[PDB]
Design a protein around this nucleic acid. Sequence first.
RNA 1: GACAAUGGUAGGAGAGCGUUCUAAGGGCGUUGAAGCAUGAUCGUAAGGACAUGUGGAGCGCUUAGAAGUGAGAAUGCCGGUG
RNA 2: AGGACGACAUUAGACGAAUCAUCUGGAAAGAUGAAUCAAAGAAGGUAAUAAUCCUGUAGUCGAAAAUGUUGUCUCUCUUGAGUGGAUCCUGAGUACGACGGAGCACGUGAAAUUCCGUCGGAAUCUGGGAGGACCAUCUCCUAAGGCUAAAUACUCUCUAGUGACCGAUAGUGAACCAGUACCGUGAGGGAAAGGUGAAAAGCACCCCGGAAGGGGAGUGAAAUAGAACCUGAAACCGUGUGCUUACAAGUAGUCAGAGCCCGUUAAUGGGUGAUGGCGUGCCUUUUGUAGAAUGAACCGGCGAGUUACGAUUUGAUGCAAGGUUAAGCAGUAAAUGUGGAGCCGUAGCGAAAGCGAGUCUGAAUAGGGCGUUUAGUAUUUGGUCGUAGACCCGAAACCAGGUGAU
Lengths: 127, 65, 116, 198
Amino acid sequence: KLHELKPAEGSRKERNRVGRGVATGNGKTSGRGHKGQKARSGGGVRPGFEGGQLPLFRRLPKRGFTNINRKEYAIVNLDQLNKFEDGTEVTPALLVESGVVKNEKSGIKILGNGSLDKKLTVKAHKF
Amino acid sequence: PKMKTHRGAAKRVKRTASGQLKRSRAFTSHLFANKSTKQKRQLRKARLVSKSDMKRVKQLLAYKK
Amino acid sequence: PRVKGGTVTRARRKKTIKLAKGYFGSKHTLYKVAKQQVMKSGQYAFRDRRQRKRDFRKLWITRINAAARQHEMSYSRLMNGLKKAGIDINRKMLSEIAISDEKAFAQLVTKAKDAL
Amino acid sequence: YDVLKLDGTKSGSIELSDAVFGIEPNNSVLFEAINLQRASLRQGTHAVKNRSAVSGGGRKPWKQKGTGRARQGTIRAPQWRGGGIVFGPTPRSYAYKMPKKMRRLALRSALSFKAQENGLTVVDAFNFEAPKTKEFKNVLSTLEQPKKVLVVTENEDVNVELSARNIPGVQVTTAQGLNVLDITNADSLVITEAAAKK
RNA sequence: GACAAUGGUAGGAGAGCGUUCUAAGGGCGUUGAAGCAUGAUCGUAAGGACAUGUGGAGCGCUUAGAAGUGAGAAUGCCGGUG
RNA sequence: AGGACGACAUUAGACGAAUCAUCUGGAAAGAUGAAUCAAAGAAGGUAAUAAUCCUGUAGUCGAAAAUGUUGUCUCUCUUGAGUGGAUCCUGAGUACGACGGAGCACGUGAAAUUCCGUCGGAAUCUGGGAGGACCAUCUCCUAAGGCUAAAUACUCUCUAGUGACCGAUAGUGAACCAGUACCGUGAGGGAAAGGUGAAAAGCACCCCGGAAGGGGAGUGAAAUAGAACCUGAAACCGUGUGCUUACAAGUAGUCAGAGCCCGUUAAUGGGUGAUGGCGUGCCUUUUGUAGAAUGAACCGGCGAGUUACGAUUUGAUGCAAGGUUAAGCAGUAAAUGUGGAGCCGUAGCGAAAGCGAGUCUGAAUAGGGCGUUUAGUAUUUGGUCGUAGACCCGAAACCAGGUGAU
Ligand SMILES: [Mg+2]
Ligand SMILES: [Mg+2]
Ligand SMILES: [Mg+2]
Ligand SMILES: [Mg+2]
Ligand SMILES: [Mg+2]
Ligand SMILES: [Mg+2]
Ligand SMILES: [Mg+2]
Ligand SMILES: [Mg+2]
Ligand SMILES: [Mg+2]
Ligand SMILES: [Mg+2]
Ligand SMILES: [Mg+2]
Ligand SMILES: [Mg+2]
Ligand SMILES: [Mg+2]
Ligand SMILES: [Mg+2]
Ligand SMILES: [Mg+2]
Ligand SMILES: [Mg+2]
Ligand SMILES: [Mg+2]
Ligand SMILES: [Mg+2]
Ligand SMILES: [Mg+2]
Ligand SMILES: [Mn+2]
Ligand SMILES: [Mn+2]
Ligand SMILES: [Mn+2]
Ligand SMILES: [Mn+2]
Ligand SMILES: [Mn+2]
Ligand SMILES: [Mn+2]
Ligand SMILES: [Mn+2]
Ligand SMILES: [Mn+2]
Ligand SMILES: [Mn+2]
Ligand SMILES: [Mn+2]
Ligand SMILES: [Mn+2]
Ligand SMILES: [Mn+2]
Ligand SMILES: [Mn+2]
Ligand SMILES: [Mn+2]
Ligand SMILES: [Mn+2]
Ligand SMILES: [Mn+2]
Ligand SMILES: [Mn+2]
Ligand SMILES: [Mn+2]
Ligand SMILES: [Mn+2]
Ligand SMILES: [Mn+2]
Ligand SMILES: [Mn+2]
Ligand SMILES: [Mn+2]
Ligand SMILES: [Mn+2]
Ligand SMILES: [Mn+2]
Ligand SMILES: [Mn+2]
Ligand SMILES: [Mn+2]
Ligand SMILES: [Mn+2]
Ligand SMILES: [Mn+2]
Ligand SMILES: [Mn+2]
Ligand SMILES: [Mn+2]
Ligand SMILES: [Mn+2]
Ligand SMILES: [Mn+2]
Ligand SMILES: [Mn+2]
Ligand SMILES: [Mn+2]
Ligand SMILES: [Mn+2]
Ligand SMILES: [Mn+2]
Ligand SMILES: [Mn+2]
Ligand SMILES: [Mn+2]
Ligand SMILES: [Mn+2]
Ligand SMILES: [Mn+2]
Ligand SMILES: [Mn+2]
Ligand SMILES: [Mn+2]
Ligand SMILES: [Mn+2]
Ligand SMILES: [Mn+2]
Ligand SMILES: [Mn+2]
Ligand SMILES: [Mn+2]
Ligand SMILES: [Mn+2]
Ligand SMILES: [Mn+2]
Ligand SMILES: [Mn+2]
Ligand SMILES: [Mn+2]
Ligand SMILES: [Mn+2]
C-alpha cells in the first residue's frame, strides 16, 4: 500500500495563493495594503490602555491537591510517584468532598474544610 | 522569535476568569471632589476589558495566564 | 525546485490566436490584441444569440403583414381573429405557409375573418 | 499459532504471538508516520541567490526623473536580468516529530497489515557470502523482502536486486514493512519486537 | 421524480485545472521520447487526448508528498524585430 | 625545560568476480532466447537504456623517502605527611568616599554588584568583603599578583562525500582565457558569450563567380546536422494563390446570409464572404473614463504574499485526568531508543499577607464582582496576527569610511 497512500480525511487543505490570477488577485485596495502595512496592533491613534495600574507579586505560593484521593485503604502520603501531584512547590489538601476511604494525610498546610473530613475517617495531619 | 508581551498592559490587566482580562478603572487617580461621591464610590469597583477591545488587544496579553 | 516557464504559455496563447482566425491583420496574429477581440467576440455572440430570437420574430411578422395586406386585412386584425378562432400557429409557421401555399394561408385568413 | 517454516524447508514449528502484532488495523496514523519518516530523510540544502544583498551591485542606475525611463534602484532589483530572487527556497529543516505512543501505533498497524496479508517467520543459520541467499529466498517468498535480528552481518545480501533492507528488530522502520511486500523474521527477533511493542 | 435558487465590484467561503521535483506502484520509447508545426477532437472551465510532419533522445500514467507553480499591462529588466 | 627506539596515519600505487546468440539498426547496453557472478546491482564511460565491454565498486595488500603521530624507554625534575599557637606574615596611594562619566537586562533611581578621570583616602585572623541602599545579627567567602587544557565560534584552503538545490536571462559577477571586453583622472563600476558529429570521416572532383556564395558529385543514420552548424516557437520580411475588393464613413468583430471553392479527428463539415441587424479596445483609477485621465511599438524569456520562529484559531490523529518531552547521549546527517529538567492541564479569588469550591470588597453567614457544576494535551493541514526588508519595484535625503584641484 506504499503507492496508494491517503491522508486522514479532514486533515490537509491546499494553502491559499493570493495574487495568482483573477479568482482573487490582490488583498485590499489602497491605504495600508502597502507592503508591511502598519498599525501596531494596539496603537489605535489615542491611548487604549492608559487607565490605571495595580501591581506587586512577592514570594511563597503553595500547590493544591484536592480530596479526590481515592487511593488505597490506608498508608502514608507525599509519595507522588503515584499518579497524582507533580511539579509541587508545597502540598495543600483541599475539599470537593468524598472521603470514601480512610488514610493518613501528611503534607504541609492542610485546608480546614478538608482536614475536618480527613480526620473524620482515619485522622491525619502533619507539616 | 517569541512574541514579546506588552508588559505595560500586563502591569494593568490580571487575567484569570474563563479567559477574560480583569479590570483596573479610569478617573481613579487624582482630581476627586469634582466627581460625585456616587461616581467616586462606583468607579472604585472594577470591570473587565470589553468584548470589542479584547478583539483588538488579544495579542499582547497572550502569555497572561 | 525551480519551475521554468516552460511550454504552458505558448500553448495557451496559441489557443486564442487560433480563435482569432478570420480576423483582420494583427487581430489575427498578436496574442495581446487577439485576446481582446476574442473576448469581445463572445461578448457579442452571447448577446447576439438572444437578439437573433427577436430579429427573427420581426421578420415573420412583417411577412405576415404582407400576406394579410393582400387580403385587405392588417396584421393587427389577423392575429385578433386567429386568437378568437383559437388557432395557435406561430408566425414562423404562419409566414412559411404564406410563402409555400397561397391557398392554405388564405383559408386561415377567412377563418380569422369570421370570429370577428 | 503462526507456522515457523524451516529455513529452506517446511518444519512448520508453530508458536504464538499476536494482538499487538495482529488484531491491530489502523491507517490514519500509518500514513502520518510514513510522511514523518520521509520528511526527516531530506536535507534542505537548497538556497536561492539574492536576498538582493547577494550579487555585486547597488549604485542608482540613473537619476529618478528627467530620463523618461522608469525609476530604478539597484541594477540587481528582482525585475532585472541577473537580479535578486524574491522568496526563493532557503535551507531549512524539513522535519517534524510525532508523539511517542503514536509512533508505536504506526509500527503495529504497519506489521499488522503484514499479518493481515502474509509475512514469514524462520529458524536462522549463518556463514559468510550469499548468492546462497537467493536459494534461501526461493524457499518461497516474493519480490521485495526484509529480514530482522538483534545481531547483524548475516546481511551480505546488501547487493540483491530488491529485497536488500535488513535491520535489527529495534532498527525497524515504517518505510519497509510498507515498502516491501513481504517480510521474514527470525524468532527471538520476532520475540524482541513483541517485547518492545507492548 | 417534482419544486426552488443561480447579475455582481471590495471581499469571505468552496471545488478544481495545469507546471517542475520526490516516492511507490505500474508502464512507453531509435519499429522514434521530449520539444516544435498542423488539424474539422473531447470536457461545464482551467484544460485533455488522438493523427500527421518535424525531430533524435528520453518520457509519461496512478496515489501521495513538496514547491523558484501559472503574466498582458509595473514610463517594469534583457534580447530580438517592427 | 630540549633530544634517542617501533605501531598507526598523511602524501605515489596494486589486485580485484561474472555473457552469449538473435531481431531491429548507422551503431545494442533495448527487445527477445538461453546463461553466470555477487563482501562487488554506487557511479561514470563505451556508436541507443550495460551488475557480467572499459574506468571502477565490495574487498584485500602496498611506502625509498618526507613530515605527522603515538605507545616506551631513556630524559629531567623529585622530598612527601601531622600538633599547637605567644609575637610575625598573607598583595596601599590599593579597597573605599565624594564629583563627572561609564557599565551591570536595571535610563540616578531606594541603586547593590563592577570599571575610568579627578581631588580625598582605611583596616591588619579582637582583621576585610559579600549577601540588591543602609545598621545590627547570621551564613558564604578571603580582593587589591600571574598562568591553565576540553566541551564553544569560523571556513580562503585539502581530502572524501551528500542534496524532492540551478541547468546557460537560471546557477557565482564569471560553465567560454572575468574582475576580462568596456567606462571613469581616480577610488570604483563591469558585461555579453556553452552545445557540429559516434567518429573530422570538415565536402577530393566538375561547375558559374575576382572572391563571397552556390548546383552537382561525395562522407554521414541524418548536412532540409555544412561550421554564424541539436532542436529551431513568435514578432518581423518575402514568394505563390483559392475566395474576395475601386459609390464607399469602417474599435474591425458578432448575428443573419447568397455566391464561389474545397472535402475533415465524418460532424445537423472546412475556406472565403455580395448584403442586412447589432456594436466607442484592454488595464488602472474613479461618484463617473469610448474618454481628450494613466499604461503598453510589437514578440519571447525573466518578473511580486515567502520562509523561520512565536501567538491564536480551525480541522485531523494519538492517548486522557492526565498529555508531553528539550538539550544530551545512541543511531546511517533518519525513524527510533533513550532522557521527565521542563511546560501546559487537574482551582479559583485577592494589589498583597493569604484563604480555598470558594474568594474579594465589607463591620455583615447582607448584597454585589470573578469562580464552582467539569477536559484537557501533544503533534500537525488550513486561516490570521506578531518578529523579521515580510507581497514587488520607486525617492529628495542622512551618516561612515574612502577617492578627486589634470
Ligand atoms: Mg493570580
Ligand atoms: Mg475597564
Ligand atoms: Mg547607498
Ligand atoms: Mg553490503
Ligand atoms: Mg530508421
Ligand atoms: Mg544496432
Ligand atoms: Mg537481457
Ligand atoms: Mg550514452
Ligand atoms: Mg578611582
Ligand atoms: Mg569537494
Ligand atoms: Mg571549385
Ligand atoms: Mg542531439
Ligand atoms: Mg516562421
Ligand atoms: Mg477624478
Ligand atoms: Mg488611453
Ligand atoms: Mg473521556
Ligand atoms: Mg459570591
Ligand atoms: Mg456570583
Ligand atoms: Mg562625512
Ligand atoms: Mn484552494
Ligand atoms: Mn492599485
Ligand atoms: Mn484599505
Ligand atoms: Mn498587504
Ligand atoms: Mn518596503
Ligand atoms: Mn513585562
Ligand atoms: Mn496598564
Ligand atoms: Mn489616588
Ligand atoms: Mn458630572
Ligand atoms: Mn530543473
Ligand atoms: Mn513566463
Ligand atoms: Mn550591496
Ligand atoms: Mn518615451
Ligand atoms: Mn544570479
Ligand atoms: Mn453569482
Ligand atoms: Mn438572476
Ligand atoms: Mn472578488
Ligand atoms: Mn479565500
Ligand atoms: Mn505513456
Ligand atoms: Mn521535462
Ligand atoms: Mn514565478
Ligand atoms: Mn528592447
Ligand atoms: Mn584493476
Ligand atoms: Mn571487472
Ligand atoms: Mn550483445
Ligand atoms: Mn575499495
Ligand atoms: Mn590575596
Ligand atoms: Mn562596597
Ligand atoms: Mn558608595
Ligand atoms: Mn557616581
Ligand atoms: Mn540585601
Ligand atoms: Mn568542516
Ligand atoms: Mn537554450
Ligand atoms: Mn580607460
Ligand atoms: Mn560534440
Ligand atoms: Mn567553394
Ligand atoms: Mn550516404
Ligand atoms: Mn542563428
Ligand atoms: Mn540548427
Ligand atoms: Mn451615391
Ligand atoms: Mn462596387
Ligand atoms: Mn456617424
Ligand atoms: Mn456586418
Ligand atoms: Mn452601427
Ligand atoms: Mn490584472
Ligand atoms: Mn483619441
Ligand atoms: Mn496618475
Ligand atoms: Mn504610451
Ligand atoms: Mn512583454
Ligand atoms: Mn485584523
Ligand atoms: Mn505578511
